[PDB]
Design a protein around this ligand. Structure first.
Ligand code: 0B1
Length: 361
């Protein structure tokens, strides 16, 4: 219910994701590690790349064990690759435990480390199914729960240098107001969920809900934007365009250029609820989808791999990754940025029929 040592354990830079301090090896080596609910590998710099403040030096760790296996991870502009092993890992501002975890020692990369960033690795918090090389490489959180008494859940309050909290093993009730509302984790690979309805300023998009989840919807701390399937993004922008016709170029809506609150509509996503024919809705503000760069980028964008509820969504809410119950809880975040008129919201219950049809097969 209360985990004060873990509050404010996240830092970062806008558009660059949130990191937690971790230690690896014996004696402990401190690194800053990006928190990513959209992947499942724990991977750290292990060589003196010129952008790195520091890196894992396996030769200094008495507890290091080599797995003698490579791992190669290309993603979308572009890549990291490394050497697998295990070692002792802890989170100084997390639970008072140390575990033996898989660690990919990064030995080559492309467009991975960021010039001027203050992080040296990534913590994939999603499930084994999407671990590389394959699902037999146990993810860090799986190892943590297996080797300790840490409950099988964590929660995130991303506040928007930005700050936030990762509560490992529980929920901190001071981080949210009102009630938590839960949506099922559809399948344990990404943190996959089902959107059953979309409103802009209360106006339904009238789209076949199946489109909202084409070909999936995921909750992803490792993505800045709210990302939507093109068909959905088209209707979204058309509506976001109309709502704000009162006062911007076409390239803006495409993230091709920048522009320098009440004119802009709220966005509600209704999520599948816990009960048959029952849903709830989460509502965000322009302050969430208009992120400082007073020049802002439009932080809603299009996708070929489905809806991605990135930091734009998550900074509105306290998000509970209730792995034990295969569900994700949303509540209004106690730190979310609002004005005096409108506030981010989590509301229910609503009656929504045929919600099962919204999931793509
Ligand atoms: C933008 O902020 C963040 C926050 C946390 C992690 C990352 C991040 C940056 C570059 C690479 C990666 C790893 C390839 C994994 C990855 C790829 C990827 O495309 N996404 C969307 C996510 N969430 N993770 C992760 C980026």
């Amino acid at each position: 219910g209360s985990f004060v040592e873990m509050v404010d354990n996240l830092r970062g830079k806008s558009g660059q994701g949130y990191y937690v301090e971790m230690t690896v090896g014996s004696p402990p080596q401190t690194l800053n590690i990006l928190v990513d609910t959209g992947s499942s590998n724990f991977a750290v710099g292990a060589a003196p790349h010129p952008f790195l403040h520091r890196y894992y030096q396996r030769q200094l760790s008495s507890t290091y064990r080599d797995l003698r296996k490579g791992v190669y991870v290309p993603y979308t502009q572009g890549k990291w690759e490394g050497e697998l092993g295990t070692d002792l890992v802890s989170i100084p501002h997390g639970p008072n435990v140390t575990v033996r975890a898989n660690i990919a020692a990064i030995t080559e990369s492309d467009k991975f480390f960021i010039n001027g960033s203050n992080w040296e690795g990534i913590l994939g918090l999603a499930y084994a199914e999407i671990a590389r090389p394959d699902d037999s490489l146990e993810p860090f959180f799986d190892s943590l729960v297996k080797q300790t008494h840490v409950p099988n859940l964590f929660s995130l309050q991303l506040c928007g240098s930005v700050g936030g909290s990762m509560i490992i093993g529980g929920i901190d009730h001071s981080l949210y107001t009102g009630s938590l509302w839960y949506t099922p984790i559809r399948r344990e690979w990404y943190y996959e969920v089902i959107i059953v309805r979309v409103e802009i300023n209360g106006q339904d998009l009238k789209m076949d809900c199946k489109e909202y989840n084409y070909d999936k919807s995921i909750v992803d701390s490792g993505t800045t934007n709210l990302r939507l399937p093109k068909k959905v993004f088209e209707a979204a922008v058309k509506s976001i365009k109309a709502a704000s016709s009162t006062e911007f170029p076409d390239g803006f809506w495409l993230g091709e250029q920048l522009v320098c609150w009440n004119i802009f509509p709220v966005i509600s996503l209704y999520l599948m609820g816990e009960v048959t024919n029952q849903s709830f809705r989460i509502t965000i503000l322009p302050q969430q989808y208009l992120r400082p760069v007073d020049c802002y980028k439009f932080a809603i964008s299009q996708s070929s791999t489905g809806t991605v509820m990135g930091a734009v969504i998550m900074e509105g809410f306290y998000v509970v990754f209730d792995r034990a119950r295969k569900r994700i809880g949303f509540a209004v975040s106690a730190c979310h940025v609002h004005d005096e008129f409108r506030t981010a919201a989590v509301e229910g219950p609503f009656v929504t029929l045929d919600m099962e049809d919204c999931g793509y097969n």
